[PDB]
Amino acid sequence: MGRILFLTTFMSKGNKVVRYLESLHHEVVICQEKVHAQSANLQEIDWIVSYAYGYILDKEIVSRFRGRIINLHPSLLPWNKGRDPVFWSVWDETPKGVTIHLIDEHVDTGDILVQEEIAFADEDTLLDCYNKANQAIEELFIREWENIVHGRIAPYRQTAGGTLHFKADRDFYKNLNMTTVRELLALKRLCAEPKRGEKPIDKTFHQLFEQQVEMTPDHVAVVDRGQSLTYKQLNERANQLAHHLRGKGVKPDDQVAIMLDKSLDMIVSILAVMKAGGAYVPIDPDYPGERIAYMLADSSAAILLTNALHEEKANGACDIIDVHDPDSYSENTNNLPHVNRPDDLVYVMYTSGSTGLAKGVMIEHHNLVNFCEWYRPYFGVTPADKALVYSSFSFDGSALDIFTHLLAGAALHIVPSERKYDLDALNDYCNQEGITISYLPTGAAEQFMQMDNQSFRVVITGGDVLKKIERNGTYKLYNGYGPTECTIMVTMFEVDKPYANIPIGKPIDRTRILILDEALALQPIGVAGELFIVGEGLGRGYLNRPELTAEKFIVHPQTGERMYRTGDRARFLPDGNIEFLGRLDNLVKIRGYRIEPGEIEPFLMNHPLIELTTVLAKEQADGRKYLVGYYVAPEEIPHGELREWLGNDLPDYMIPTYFVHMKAFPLTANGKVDRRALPDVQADAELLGEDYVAPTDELEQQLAQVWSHVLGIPQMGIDDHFLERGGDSIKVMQLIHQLKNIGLSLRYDQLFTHPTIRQLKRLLTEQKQVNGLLEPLRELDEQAEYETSAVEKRMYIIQQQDVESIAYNVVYTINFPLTVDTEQIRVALEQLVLRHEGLRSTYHMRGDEIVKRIVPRAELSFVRQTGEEESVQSLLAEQIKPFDLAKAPLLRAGVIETADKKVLWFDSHHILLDGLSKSILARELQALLGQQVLSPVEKTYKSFARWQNEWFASDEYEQQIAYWKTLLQGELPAVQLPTKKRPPQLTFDGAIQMYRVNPEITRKLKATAAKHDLTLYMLMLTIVSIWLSKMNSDSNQVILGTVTDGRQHPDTRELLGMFVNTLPLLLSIDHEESFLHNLQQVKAKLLPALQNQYVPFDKILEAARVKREGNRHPLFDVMFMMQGAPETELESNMHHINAGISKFDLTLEVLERENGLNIVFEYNTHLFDEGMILRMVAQFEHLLLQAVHGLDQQVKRFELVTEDEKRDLFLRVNDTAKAYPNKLIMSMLEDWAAATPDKTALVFREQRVTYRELNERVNQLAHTLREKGVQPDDLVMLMAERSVEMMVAIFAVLKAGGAYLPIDPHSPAERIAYIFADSGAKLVLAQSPFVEKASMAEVVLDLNSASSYAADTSNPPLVNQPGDLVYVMYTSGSTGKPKGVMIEHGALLNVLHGMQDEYPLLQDDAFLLKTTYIFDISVAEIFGWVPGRGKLVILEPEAEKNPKAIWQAVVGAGITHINFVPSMLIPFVEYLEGRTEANRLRYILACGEAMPDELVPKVYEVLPEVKLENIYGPTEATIYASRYSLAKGSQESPVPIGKPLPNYRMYIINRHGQLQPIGVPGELCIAGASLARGYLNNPALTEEKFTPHPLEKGERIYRTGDLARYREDGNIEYLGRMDHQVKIRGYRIELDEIRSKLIQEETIQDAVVVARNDQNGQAYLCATVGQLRELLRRELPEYMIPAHFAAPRTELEATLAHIWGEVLGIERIGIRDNFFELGGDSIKGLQIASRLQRINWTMVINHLFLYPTIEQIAPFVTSEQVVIEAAAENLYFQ
């Protein structure tokens, strides 16, 4: 051992590594600060271990301790060196691992000592990756430190490569810590920089225009009125005016104004200014003369291009150049010399309508060129197109209208104001001129979609929010987005389908869009933020407004990129598109809620009568705002109709107050909807709506005020619906309590039946005011010890089973900015300690009574630590330590400070912190952190315990206990979730998965619930119940637990304590009824339970007398909780932490956050894994969406499996197609014989038959059979034992044309007569001893008489097609008389070809004929040698029962393929153990029954080099269907039947015909090529069993009647027949599991495991009885025990027997009696241990679950050694 200097800056001081070093007995000196070269911490040090050291060691230290400085870097070096390594391992897609290396004089460039490869998942968050990485580096240390310190590890140098990263290189990706890996990479692809851009723009516009004028000189360029201009005519006239302009003084970047109207001269003037060198400044001639003067002066334009009509509007302010004066045009018609550069200004357009007078946005040439060069190839603009110059030339819409199409050879058509506003006449012009492409603003576009157009192929829109996609035309609709500051548009979207929010699209050429937060950091995909524009569209800025330009055009502080601040909110969608979410300022507050009014219009337009809609948010002088819904419809729509229409998907405040009908929306002069021309509502006054009905009496007013107080709404109406206007379950109780003060008693259920004030009055009008309904909580007087509540006693008892358990520790974190004072937070928390007695309460035990003791003051543990992002979790994990309930405060806190945040953490116990208590702690801490004063508390928890303990003596309490005792009487339901194998003892290890319901779906969920008089909890509980039922094999009843607030007295809603109560919920799902029906059923069962919600759970269990198993939890195993929305802002930024704990098998908590729902899936990791839960989360989402849209659909019609799961099943199971030769088997033999005539084909006894000899004898009997009247699909029955004649018969039947029907010769005549009839067959090819056995049925031949053969040895002609019958195998199945399965040739061929592909029988191979030919397996032996041209060794009759003989055949005949039904393989392997003969055997193909798991090793030990295979298949799928290859080193838990064969498909379906997902059981169904034609002469049965199904798209499926389940591997597991299913108390019983467990003991070799119906037709499993139960007590659950198959020895056991008999109540207790079998509860163990402690016998309550008997726990209860003598025994006074 030696001294180690542990260097850590961001990790803990007592990490797992330091402790492992201290266990190996090292002295670990820990230094967290910078060490100096000659410090004391450096003396007498033998090793230096570093872990997250945030300093650099001096070069002397590195050299002085060279080879002795070890670092722990959580990265696979050389990759991701430096800082934040795990994140950069994911973002840069580098290899993943951990490295223990040596420290040099640089950053992580040392010789690697040991290195492991970690693996991160796609569904893992970055935080999960941090945790996984930190563990690996700590385990790698524990695993290799001894090899390192002892020099057993040779350092190898770092390989070439790697990345190096520094601190603050991550400041842009800070909001991405809770994002999954695949999502992180998706954002990277979607937002990263490409490859140094495309190509730089090296051209101006006039340059490219002059190149197009040379390409299409004589094409029409512009068309105004009836006259036209060609490209060359336009170019030359512009060139003429440009020579005039340039000579007049136009220089680059100069601003020349144009005040012309839409004409041919406007296009000439625009190109003239450009060719001269300037930028055109469009001034609309109709603008106010002041606006005109402003632009001219702001633009500092010396030259104005106008005419004589608009001349005087300049007031002599510029050099007027008349565009009609000929002297203004020169004689030079040639292209001017170029004086411009791509960075030169091209135009300046003024934008206004808001703050400021008007700002001049300046655009450059490279900006426009980049747009025009993207426009042409994107829309396929050709010289054949015609475009419309629609927008005013003062708006960038005209830039698109003019410049984009000019660069493509198209023709511009000028639009006079005569048609710009008559859009019927515009459609005329377009249709009669062939206008193919144009840009129409949103409002004008939505009013052009009604016109009937045939000319347009592409119509682009944008400007406002597009809602309408239905149009009377054949043109494509495109939606664009872009500010004027960038060029025209930056994103485009093709509207392909209806959308609620039509995306604005994807960025264009050389343009990138980022969604950033307030700190200018990258938001994750789907998270909203401000849109930022990067690329070649961004212009210079604003004219003479440098402040606003620096404000909106910012260079990013981190990415170093110029970006434009849009001020618009948007989010990226997963497809790569962006969607506009509104302006970051245009949110109004309604009823106290900030909303976007544009989120309402889409729902209103979905009304079948509304075509156009617009929602405005006007206000009154009082200040409050109201929403007005303007709509265009054929006629007016009733107000209540629009209110109801929106009530299906929207909340009350998002429903507009008033609606206004319009015939046509007024449009501004630029194609937008004139919002300020929309009629203002007359009744703005104060009209609380047309729905407002004022209270008409004193009670309606009294109720309306109480409703106002509880709901927060002013002036309620007598028709307002409680649940529709914010009503919650908590608010219902608040209404009830506020009514008790009035004197009126209302029941919880009566509110849901009277949800308006109108109805409530009728309920309460006859009541009389009764005083005393609400009695104050009496403040207890001072005592030494106080009373504890029922929950506090429970929680105490829980923490006593494992005194070191953290399963009920409550850990929350809040991330504060670094500007918060850490000590201020601690001071506030120390104020919260004295403010609440719970934070100073301790719990002790007085005899057998748990009591509370209040302490006047307690000191808080406030640990300050420094850490990094990838270490915060690790630091916090080492701080969750067990709590001693006798010590206060029961809360520990601390602040972890990083370089970007201060993370406050606090850890409490459930005994004090519950749901509401957390919300009060939030609000109070937030108020204290704001230095706000708090009114001192008024009540205390210790008083509520007194009141409630007295209520337990009331009559109401007994009334409620009786409810639960009858509710949970009788056999309760059993919810068998598709879990992993349940561990014997209960485990609490867990993880969490999270599912987010978006705000849109959340809104539809709540609106749906309120509309049908339900709460969101009721609606969620129903979906959860259906979800559980569909996993419990579509059970009709389900059971689960829930949690209530538990605040009985209304005075306890401000206290800090444990109030919540756990309730058992027994609900029912009717799959034959609708979702709406089931919703009411759940409520009809929830409300009675909430009426008896104040009985403690332990008493409910006792009233129900619930049996205690060990694999499951008491009454339920799945828990569903729900929390409301956060009350404060601190509560919304609190984060609950799971320490890897799952109190139940599965817990679902719904949390309302961010206007959506965060659903947590806490699960036991021993029962579910990462993949399983992910499947269940997607199934819940699938059911939720199906339900919220299928309110009236039957629940059976909701499918649990998902489409992704269906595709996954297909590949892993049912992708089995293979092309197989259609040559029949009877031909194959005759072909083989012709080529190998003298090769061995059959071997019987010691005689051999060759292919030629076989074939020839076959041919003879065939020629005989042919003239006997044998044609295709004829049946001739066989009566023969194993011989060569049976083989000749079969093949001859097939050559003649018929099908062969094997009948056992030794079958009773009763049977034969049956098949003789059912088949209706005539020929009976029988052997000599059985010719008369046919009783001369019809024509009976003799296979042994040569008369029944013929002379012709030539191959009979082919007379069969691949669809003809080849054989008919009767079934004689259970509960049935023999039925004839008809198998065709191509069916048999497929199995033979597929089995050969798997187990090929080649020429040098052989099969053994040992299966009786009345079983289909024999067919695989009869024909399995033909494909590969092998041979068949016919075993002697009745030798299948002699393993001696079977073995001999394998040895002497070199057999490779053999079939063995299980139970006949065991006698075979019991013979081969004491044997050593050589073998050629290759495959043991097993089928017929389930393979015992013990058989697999038994086989591979007597026959190594063999390949054991388990194969399954019903007779109706020819022979086989699925197979599973077993391996030597394997221990399959049920031994699966496997995956289907080639061209086979297997489906597991439920009782309603739906594909079951993995784990969920159902009926196995076969489909594919090798299916039976049907049952012979039983078309009834053929219809019930061979049914068409949508899975096979009308093709048939065979219902096997076998229960089966899919496996994560994909292999199907056999679960038995659907009938003959054994269930104890609703749980399925697998008799093999109990047999397997009853066999591994040497004493037992014979294991009988079966069920007997007993007493009232009830069933019970039958097979040392209590010892046998003990052997099965472990491993097996108490529903799987066979119902049918006093001696204390030391003082301790006598003492234990006495104490047990008192607590358990069993007068007679034995040392071998099971605690839980005698009534052992968790309550009992505490009593037993406490009575033992009082007599100095220390016993652990946990031990009672591991050692449940007296003698088993006897050596574990220790004595408390007492000291009898004192230090002072004799005293002498002096």
Ligand SMILES: *P(=O)(=O)O[C]C([C])([C])[C]([O])C(=O)[N][C][C]C(=O)[N][C][C][N]C(=O)[C]([N][C]=O)[C]([C])[C]
């Ligand atoms: P209605 O809306 O149909 O009401 C149904 C309920 C859910 C029964 C309602 O009445 C109710 O009681 N809501 C509050 C229940 C509650 O307290 N939920 C949170 C419970 N969880 C905890 O107390 C702990 N862990 C996580 O929350 C705690 C340590 C924070």
Ligand SMILES: *P(=O)(O)OCC(C)(C)[C@@H](O)C(=O)NCCC(=O)NCCNC(=O)CN
């Ligand atoms: P014992 O074998 O441990 O069981 C008997 C008890 C009644 C003591 C035990 O089952 C019990 O306490 N059940 C109720 C506790 C419970 O289900 N949840 C705890 C309450 N807190 C939460 O559920 C999380 N918010």
Ligand SMILES: [Mn+2]
């Ligand atoms: Mn490092």
